[PDB]
C-alpha cells in the first residue's frame, strides 16, 4: 500500500503490457528504455503531494496503455494452466484408509509416513504452548507464523507440507 | 391381486418376530421375492383391462406404477439403514413395519376399482408417510411440516369425497368399469364448475402445480431418505394417477375449465425450473425438479390426446426412478459430511472416482438424454402440447434449455472443481451405495430397450 | 525416457538428420504435385465468355419500322 | 415449355416436366434439337436440373465411370463433351439475353419516340 | 550436467548493436540485457524472409517437375 | 470495478480501516487456522450457515407490507403472464375457427 | 514428459548465470550469499527489473507481494525451489 | 523492506521439512509394487473382426427373409447401353 509497491507495481505491469505490445524484443527494449528514463528522472524528489499527483497521472496515462489481452504467463490464472492438473491432487489424509492389502502393496512408504505420524503426534503440545504464549491479546496484529526456538518443528506445519504440482 | 396383498401382510410379522440383526436380511430377501411376482403381474393384453376380482383390478397404468412400488420397497428399506443402525429393536421393527403398511395401502390405491375405496385407501396412504417423516425426520426445528402438511392435503382434499358421493347416488355404481360406458356429457355451467374444480384441484394439490408448490420443498428436506423415496417417487404419481382416471367424465368441461390451469402449469414449469437453478442446499434442487416434471405431467393430463398420456405415464415412471435415485445420491453424499448444503464440499471426481459414474449417469437421465425413458415421455408430451398450441414450444423447449442447465449444474460443484481439503472424513464409497445406485439405473437403462411395457393404456 | 533428446539451454536445438530429410521430401512432394498438375491443368478451361458482336445479328431488324 | 399438355394425364411433376423439353422449347425459328427418351432418362436415374438436353453426352459419362471402375481418371473427354455441349447451350441462353435486350432497346426507343412525334 | 558455459555474446554487430547505437545517440549509456543478444546470435539470425517459406522446397520439387514430362517425351 | 481516484486514505481511515479491518481478519484467519490432528469430520465454520439460513427466506412467512412491494410483485407476474393467457386463448380460438371452417389444410394429420 | 526438472545445481547455475549476464554490475562479486542490494547498491526499481526478466527466464508465478522483498540470490533460488518441485 | 528475520528462519526450516518429506516421497526401494503374494497374431485379430462378420452376416441371412421390408436398395442404375440404345450422335470435333 506504501508508495514503494504502488510505484513499483505500476512500473512492473507497465513493462508487462509493453511486453505484450511489441515484437522481436528489441523495439520492446529501447522503448522500455525510454520508459526507464521516464521513471528514472523521477524518485529524486522527496516532495510529498507533487509525487502521488504525478503518479495518478501515470495511472490514467498507463490505463490508456492496456490492450485487452495482456500477456499472461501460464501458471498464474490465465488461459493456459492455472491448475490444469487439479484433478490429480489427492490430499495425504486420503490413503489414511486403504485396504490393508493395498496398504501392504507398497510395504515401505508408511514406515517413514509413520515416522511423520509420530513426529506430529508427539507434537502440537509444544506448538499450542508456544503459540498461546506468543500471541498478543487476540493475536490481532500478525498474520505471520514465527518459528520455534527449541530444537524441533515449526509449529503450524501440517498443511504447509503439500501435495505438489505436477 | 389378493396374491399380492397377503405376502406383504405376512411380511409384517416376519419383521415383528425375528432375531436381532436379521431383520434387514429377512425383510430385504422376502421383499425382493415379492418383486418377482410383481413382475408376474403383466398379463395385460388386447383391449379389456384385466380384472382380478370384482373389488379391484388392473389396467395398464396401474400395472407399471404398481411394479414400480413393489420394486421400490426393497431398495428403499435397503437404503434406509445406516441412517440409524443404532437404536432399540422396537424402533427398527416399527420403521420397517411402517414402510410395509404404507406399501400395502399403496397397492390398495393403485389396484382399487371403486373410487371411494380409492379415497379411503388414499388418506390411509398419507398417514404412514406422515408418521415416518415426522417421528424422526432429522427435524430441523421440525417446521411442523408433516402435520399442517396433512392440512395442505385435507384442506381442499376432503370435498372430493362430497363430489364423489354425489356422483354415487346420481348414477349408482362408482365402480370404474361401469362408471365407464355410463358416462354422460356434462354441460358447462356453474354447478359443473364447482364440481370439476372440486375434483381437479383436489388431486392437483398432490402433484404440485406452480401455485401450490410450496408444499414440497420443506416436507422433502425434512424427510428421512426412506420417506423421500416414498414421497417424490410415488406420492405425486397418486395424484396424477387418480387424475388420469377421474378425467374420464368431465368431458367438455375440461376445456373451458382446463385453460387457466394449463396456462399456470406452462408458466410455472419455467418459473420452478428457474428457481431450482440458483438455490444452495442440494436436497431442494431435486425437489423443485420434481415440481417441474410434475407440472409437465399436469399439462399432459388436461390436454386429452393419447400421445399426451403415453408420454405422461412414461414420465411418471422415468421420473420416479430418476428423482428417487438422485435423492439417494444426495443422501449418500450427506452421510459423508453433515451439511445438506451443496456448495460446502466439492470434488469427488478425485475422491470416490466410481461414485462419479452414478452422479453423471443419473443426472444425464434427468437431463433428458435421447434413449432414456425420461426423454421418451418428455418427448411425446412435447409433441402433444405442440399439437394443442403451435406457440407453446417456446415455453416447452425453454424448459428444455433450463432443465439442461440446472440438471447439469448439479452434476458440477458437488462433484467437480476442487477438494475442500478441510474435510478429511469421507470414507470411500460402500458396496451398499453401489447396490442402490445400480438397482436404480440398470432397470432405467434396460427399459430404454423395451419401453412398450411402460407406455400407457392407449398403445 | 532419454532419446538423446539433449535438453539444451541457449544453443541451437539439435536436430535429427532424417527429420529434415522427411520435411524437405514433402516440400518436393507439394510443389512437384502442384506445378505438375498445373502443367496438367488450365485456369481458363473452355471457350471464352461471349461478346456482343453477335448482338448485332442485324438480320433480326424490325420488319414494320423501316 | 412448348405446350400446356394437361393434368388429365394423371402426372404431376417429372412425367410432366415443364414439358418433356426441360428449359424453353424454342418456337422461334425451328423446333428444338433431337431428343433423349424419357424412359431411358428415368432408368438411368438423373436428378432434375441435372436433366436437360446434351444428356446424349452425360449418360455416356455415367457409362464411363462404371466403364472402368478402378481407373479414377477414365474419360476426361466425355466430361469435356457435356462440358462443351452445355457450354454452347448456356451460351445460347446468353444469345437469348442478347436478342431480348436488343428488342427492348429497338422497339422501346424507336416506337416511343417515333410514336411521340405527333 | 548441462554445461551452459558463459560469457560469449558481447552485444556486437547484432541488432541490439544498432539499438544501443540509437540509445547511445540519446545518451542513455546502454540499458541492460546481453541475454536477448543470445536471442540473436547463433544458427539463428540468418532466419528467413517470408515468401521464402513458399520458396522452401522448390529446388528439388520442381526439379522433379522438370524431369516429370521426361516420361511422355521419351 | 475500475479502481480509480487512488484514494489518499487520510489518517483515520488509514489507522481505523487498517488496524480494525486486518485486526478482525487475522483474528478469524488464525481462528479457523488451528488445523490440528484428531478432527475426523468437517471444520463446520459458522460462516455460510448464516448464508444458508438467511437465504432460506426468514422473512418469507411473516408478511409483506405494501410500500412498493405488491406493485413490484403483482406487476412482476402481471404483464407477460395475463397477456400470454390472452394470446394462447386467441390463437386457440383461431385454430378452432380454421378447423371448423374453410381449411386448415391438415389433410393427413392423424396422430395428434 | 517435459522431462528435465530444475534441480538445485541447475537453478543455481541459472540465477547465477543470468546475474552474471547483467552488465551494469560485474561478475566480480556474485555469490548466493553476496548481498543482492547492499553489496551492489542496485536500484530497487532495478531489482524489480531483475525479478521481471528472471521470471521471464523461468516463466511463471512470482506475485508482486512476494517479489517485492526477495533480495539475495540464494533466496530467489529458494522461492523458485519450493514453488517449483526441486528437492530430491 | 527485506523481510522479517523470524520469517527467514521459519521459511528456512520449512524448507528443511520439504527436503525430508520429499526425500521420503520419492519411492524406489525394492520396487515396492509386489502385487501377488508375425502373421498368426494378426490373423487372430482378423478373427476379432471376422466373428462379427459371422454373427452379423448370419443375422442378416435369416433376418432379411424373415421380415418383409429391410435392406431396401436403390434400383441398380440401368443404361441404354444395356437393353436398347438410341442416340444418333456425332460432332463437335
Ligand atoms: C453407444 C449407444 C448409444 C449411446 C448414446 C449416448 C452416448 C453417451 C452416453 C453418456 C456417456 C456414457 C459414459 O461413458 O459415461 C461414463 C461412464 C462411467 O465412466 P467413468 O466414470 O468416467 O469411468 C469409470 C471409472 O473411472 C472407473 O471404473 P472402471 O473403469 O473400473 O469401470 C467402468 C465401467 C465398468 O463396468 C461396470 O461397472 C459393469 C457394468 C455392468 C452392466 C450390466 C448390465 O463402468 C462403471 O464402473 C460404472 C458405469 C457403468 C454403469 C452401468 C452401465 C451404464 C451404461 C451407460 C450408457 C452406455 C454408455 C456406453 C455405451 C457403449 C456401448 C455399449 O461410462 C459409461 O456409462 C459406460 C458404461 C459401460 C458399461 C456397460 C456397457 C454396456 C451397457 C448396455 C448398453 C447401454 C446402452 C445405453 C444407451 C444410452 C442410455 C442413456
Ligand atoms: C458383465 C457383462 C454385462 C453385459 C451387459 C450387456 C452388454 C451388451 C451386449 C450383450 C450381449 C449378450 C446378450 C445376451 C445373449 C443373447 C443374445 C441373443 O441371442 O440375442 C438375440 C436373441 C433373439 O432370440 P429370440 O428369443 O428369437 O428373440 C427374442 C426377442 O429378442 C425379444 O424381443 P425384445 O424386444 O425383448 O428384444 C430383446 C432386447 C430388449 O429386452 C428388453 O428390453 C428387456 C427389458 C427388461 C426390463 C426389466 C425391468 C425390471 C424391473 O434385449 C436385448 O436385445 C438384449 C439387451 C439386454 C440385456 C440385459 C442383460 C441383463 C442386464 O435375443 C433374445 O432372445 C433376447 C434375450 C433376452 C434378454 C436378456 C438377455 C441377456 C441375459 C443376461 C446376459 C448378460 C451378459 C452376459 C455377458 C456378455 C459379455 C461377456
UniProtKB/Swiss-Prot annotation, chain B:
The compartments listed are:
Mitochondrion inner membrane
Q: What is its EC number?
A: 7.1.1.2
Q: Where are the transmembrane segments?
A: 22-42, 60-80, 98-118, 147-167, 196-216, 224-244, 256-276, 284-303, 308-330, 351-371, 391-411
Q: Chief localization class?
A: mitochondrion
Spell out the reaction equation it catalyses: a ubiquinone + NADH + 5 H(+)(in) = a ubiquinol + NAD(+) + 4 H(+)(out)
A GO cellular component annotation here is: respiratory chain complex I
Q: How does it sit in the membrane?
A: Multi-pass membrane protein
Gene Ontology terms for molecular function: NADH dehydrogenase (ubiquinone) activity; ubiquinone binding
A GO term (biological process) for this protein?
A: mitochondrial respiratory chain complex I assembly
Q: Which UniProt keywords apply?
A: Electron transport, Membrane, Mitochondrion, Mitochondrion inner membrane, NAD, Respiratory chain, Translocase, Transmembrane, Transmembrane helix, Transport, Ubiquinone
Q: Does the keyword Mitochondrion apply?
A: yes
For this protein, the record's NCBIfam families field holds: NDH_I_M (TIGR01972)
Family statement: Belongs to the complex I subunit 4 family.
Q: What does this protein do?
A: Core subunit of the mitochondrial membrane respiratory chain NADH dehydrogenase (Complex I) which catalyzes electron transfer from NADH through the respiratory chain, using ubiquinone as an electron acceptor. Essential for the catalytic activity and assembly of complex I.
**Oligomer and partners:** Core subunit of respiratory chain NADH dehydrogenase (Complex I) which is composed of 45 different subunits.
Protein name, entry field: NADH-ubiquinone oxidoreductase chain 4
Q: Report the source organism.
A: Ovis aries
Phylogenetic lineage: Eukaryota, Metazoa, Chordata, Craniata, Vertebrata
Amino acid at each position: 500500500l506504501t508508495h514503494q509497491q504502488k510505484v513499483l507495481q505500476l512500473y512492473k505491469r507497465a513493462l508487462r503490457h509493453l511486453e505484450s505490445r511489441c515484437v522481436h524484443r528489441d523495439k520492446y527494449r529501447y522503448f522500455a528504455c525510454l520508459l526507464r528514463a521516464r521513471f528514472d528522472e523521477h524518485k529524486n524528489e522527496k516532495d510529498m503531494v507533487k509525487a502521488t499527483q504525478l503518479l495518478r497521472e501515470a495511472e490514467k496515462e498507463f490505463w490508456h496503455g492496456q490492450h485487452p489481452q495482456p500477456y499472461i504467463f501460464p501458471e498464474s490464472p490465465g488461459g493456459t494452466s492455472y491448475e490444469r492438473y487439479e484433478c490429480y491432487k489427492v490430499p495425504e489424509w486420503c490413503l489414511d484408509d486403504w485396504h490393508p492389502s493395498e496398504k501392504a502393496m507398497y510395504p515401505d512408504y508408511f514406515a517413514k509416513r509413520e515416522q511423520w505420524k509420530k513426529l506430529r503426534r508427539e507434537s502440537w503440545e509444544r506448538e499450542v504452548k508456544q503459540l498461546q504464549e506468543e500471541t498478543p491479546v487476540g493475536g490481532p496484529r500478525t498474520e505471520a507464523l514465527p518459528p520455534a526456538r527449541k530444537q524441533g518443528d515449526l509449529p503450524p506445519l501440517w498443511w504447509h507440507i503439500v501435495t505438489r504440482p505436477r | 391381486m389378493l396374491k399380492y396383498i397377503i405376502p406383504t401382510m405376512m411380511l409384517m410379522p416376519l419383521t415383528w418376530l425375528s432375531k436381532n440383526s436379521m431383520i434387514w436380511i429377512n425383510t430385504t430377501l422376502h421383499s425382493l421375492l415379492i418383486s418377482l411376482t410383481s413382475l408376474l403381474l403383466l398379463n395385460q393384453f388386447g383391449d379389456n383391462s384385466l380384472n382380478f376380482s370384482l373389488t379391484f383390478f388392473s389396467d395398464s397404468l396401474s400395472t407399471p406404477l404398481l411394479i414400480l412400488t413393489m420394486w421400490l420397497l426393497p431398495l428403499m428399506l435397503m437404503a434406509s439403514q445406516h441412517h440409524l443402525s443404532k437404536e432399540n429393536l422396537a424402533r427398527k421393527k416399527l420403521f420397517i413395519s411402517m414402510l410395509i403398511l404404507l406399501q400395502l395401502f399403496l397397492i390398495m390405491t393403485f389396484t382399487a376399482t371403486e373410487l371411494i375405496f380409492f379415497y379411503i385407501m388414499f388418506e390411509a396412504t398419507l398417514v404412514p408417510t406422515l408418521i415416518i417423516i415426522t417421528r424422526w425426520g432429522n427435524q430441523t426445528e421440525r417446521l411442523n411440516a408433516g402435520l399442517y402438511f396433512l392440512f395442505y392435503t385435507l384442506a381442499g382434499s376432503l370435498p372430493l369425497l362430497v363430489a364423489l358421493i354425489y356422483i354415487q347416488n346420481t348414477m349408482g355404481s362408482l365402480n370404474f368399469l361401469i362408471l365407464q360406458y355410463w358416462v354422460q356429457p356434462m354441460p358447462n355451467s356453474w354447478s359443473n364448475t364447482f364440481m370439476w374444480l372440486a375434483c381437479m384441484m383436489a388431486f392437483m394439490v398432490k402433484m404440485p402445480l406452480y401455485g401450490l408448490h410450496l408444499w414440497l420443498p420443506k416436507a422433502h428436506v425434512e424427510a428421512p431418505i426412506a420417506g423421500s423415496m416414498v414421497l417424490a417417487a410415488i406420492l405425486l404419481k397418486l395424484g396424477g394417477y387418480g387424475m388420469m382416471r377421474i378425467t374420464l367424465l368431465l368431458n367438455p368441461i375440461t376445456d373451458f375449465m382446463a385453460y387457466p390451469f394449463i396456462m399456470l402449469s406452462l408458466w410455472g414449469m419455467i418459473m420452478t425450473s428457474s428457481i431450482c437453478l440458483r438455490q444452495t442446499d442440494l436436497k431442494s434442487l431435486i425437489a423443485y425438479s420434481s415440481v417441474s416434471h410434475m407440472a409437465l405431467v399436469i399439462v399432459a393430463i388436461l390436454i386429452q390426446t393419447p400421445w399426451s398420456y403415453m408420454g405422461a405415464t412414461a414420465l411418471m415412471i422415468a421420473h420416479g426412478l430418476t428423482s428417487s435415485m438422485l435423492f439417494c445420491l444426495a443422501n449418500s453424499n450427506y452421510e459423508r459430511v453433515h451439511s445438506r448444503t451443496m456448495i460446502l464440499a466439492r470434488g469427488l471426481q478425485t475422491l470416490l472416482p466410481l461414485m462419479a459414474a452414478w452422479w453423471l449417469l443419473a443426472s444425464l437421465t434427468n437431463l433428458a438424454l435421447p434413449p432414456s425413458i425420461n426423454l421418451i415421455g418428455e418427448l411425446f408430451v412435447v409433441m402433444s402440447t405442440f399439437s394443442w398450441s403451435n406457440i407453446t414450444i417456446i415455453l416447452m423447449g425453454l424448459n428444455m434449455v433450463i432443465t439442461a442447465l440446472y440438471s447439469l449444474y448439479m452434476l458440477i460443484t458437488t462433484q467437480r472443481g476442487k477438494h475442500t481439503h478441510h474435510i478429511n472424513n469421507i470414507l470411500p464409497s460402500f458396496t451398499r451405495e453401489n447396490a442402490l445406485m445400480s438397482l436404480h439405473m440398470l432397470p432405467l437403462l434396460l427399459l430404454s430397450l423395451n419401453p412398450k411395457i411402460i407406455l400407457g393404456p392407449l398403445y | 525416457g532419454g532419446a538423446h533428446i539433449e535438453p539444451r539451454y541457449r544453443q541451437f536445438p539439435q536436430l535429427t538428420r532424417s527429420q529434415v530429410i522427411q520435411a524437405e521430401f514433402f516440400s518436393a512432394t507439394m510443389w512437384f504435385w502442384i506445378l505438375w498438375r498445373f502443367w496438367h491443368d488450365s485456369d481458363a478451361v473452355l471457350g471464352h465468355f461471349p461478346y456482343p458482336d453477335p448482338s448485332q445479328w442485324t438480320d433480326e431488324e424490325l420488319g414494320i419500322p423501316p | 415449355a412448348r405446350r400446356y399438355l394437361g393434368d388429365a394425364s394423371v402426372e404431376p411433376e417429372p412425367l410432366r416436366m415443364p414439358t418433356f423439353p426441360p428449359d424453353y422449347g424454342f418456337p422461334e425459328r425451328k423446333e428444338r434439337e433431337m431428343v433423349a427418351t424419357q424412359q431411358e432418362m428415368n432408368d438411368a436415374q438423373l436428378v432434375l436440373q441435372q436433366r436437360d438436353y446434351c444428356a446424349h453426352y452425360l449418360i455416356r459419362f455415367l457409362k464411363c465411370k462404371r466403364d472402368s471402375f478402378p481407373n479414377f481418371l477414365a474419360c476426361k473427354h466425355e466430361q469435356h463433351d457435356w462440358d462443351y455441349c452445355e457450354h454452347l447451350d448456356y451460351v445460347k441462353r446468353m444469345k437469348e439475353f442478347e436478342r431480348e435486350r436488343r428488342l427492348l432497346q429497338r422497339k422501346k426507343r424507336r416506337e416511343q419516340r417515333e410514336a411521340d412525334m405527333a | 550436467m548441462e554445461l551452459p558455459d558463459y560469457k560469449q555474446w558481447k552485444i556486437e554487430g547484432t541488432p541490439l548493436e544498432t539499438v544501443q547505437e540509437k540509445l547511445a545517440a540519446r545518451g542513455l549509456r546502454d540499458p541492460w540485457g546481453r541475454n536477448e543478444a543470445w536471442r540473436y546470435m547463433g544458427g539463428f539470425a540468418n532466419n528467413v524472409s517470408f515468401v521464402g517459406a513458399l520458396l522452401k522446397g522448390f529446388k528439388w520439387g520442381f526439379a522433379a517437375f522438370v524431369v516429370a514430362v521426361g516420361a511422355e517425351y521419351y | 470495478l475500475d479502481p480509480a481516484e487512488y484514494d489518499i486514505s487520510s489518517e483515520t481511515r488509514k489507522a481505523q480501516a487498517e488496524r480494525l479491518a486486518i485486526r478482525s481478519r487475522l483474528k478469524r484467519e488464525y481462528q479457523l487456522q488451528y488445523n490440528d490432528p484428531s478432527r475426523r469430520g468437517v471444520v463446520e465454520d459458522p460462516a455460510l450457515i448464516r448464508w444458508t439460513c438467511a437465504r432460506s427466506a426468514n422473512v418469507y412467512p411473516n408478511f409483506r407490507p405494501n410500500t412498493k412491494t405488491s406493485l413490484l410483485g403483482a406487476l412482476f407476474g402481471i404483464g407477460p403472464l395475463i397477456f400470454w393467457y390472452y394470446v394462447f386463448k386467441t390463437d386457440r380460438d383461431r385454430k378452432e375457427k380454421l378447423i371448423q371452417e374453410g381449411k386448415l389444410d391438415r389433410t393427413f394429420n392423424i396422430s395428434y | 514428459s517435459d522431462a528435465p526438472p530444475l534441480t538445485l545445481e541447475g537453478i543455481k547455475d541459472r540465477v547465477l548465470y543470468v546475474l552474471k549476464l547483467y552488465d551494469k554490475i560485474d561478475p566480480e562479486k556474485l555469490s548466493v550469499n553476496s548481498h543482492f542490494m547492499k553489496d551492489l547498491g542496485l536500484d530497487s526499481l532495478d531489482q524489480v527489473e531483475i525479478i521481471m526478466a528472471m521470471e521471464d527466464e523461468f516463466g511463471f508465478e512470482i506475485p508482486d507481494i512476494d517479489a517485492e522483498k526477495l533480495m539475495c540470490p540464494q533466496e530467489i533460488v529458494d522461492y523458485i525451489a519450493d514453488k517449483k518441485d526441486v528437492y530430491e | 523492506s527485506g523481510y522479517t528475520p523470524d520469517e527467514k528462519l521459519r521459511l528456512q526450516q520449512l524448507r528443511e521439512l520439504r527436503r525430508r518429506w520429499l526425500k521420503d516421497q520419492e519411492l524406489s526401494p525394492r520396487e515396492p509394487v509386489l502385487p501377488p503374494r508375425t502373421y498368426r497374431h494378426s490373423i487372430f485379430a482378423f478373427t476379432h473382426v471376422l466373428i462379427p462378420v459371422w454373427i452379423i452376416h448370419y443375422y442378416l441371412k435369416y433376418h432379411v427373409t424373415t421380415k418383409p421390408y429391410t435392406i431396401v436398395e436403390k434400383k441398380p442404375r440401368i443404361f441404354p447401353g444395356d437393353t436398347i440404345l438410341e442416340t444418333g450422335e456425332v460432332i463437335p470435333p
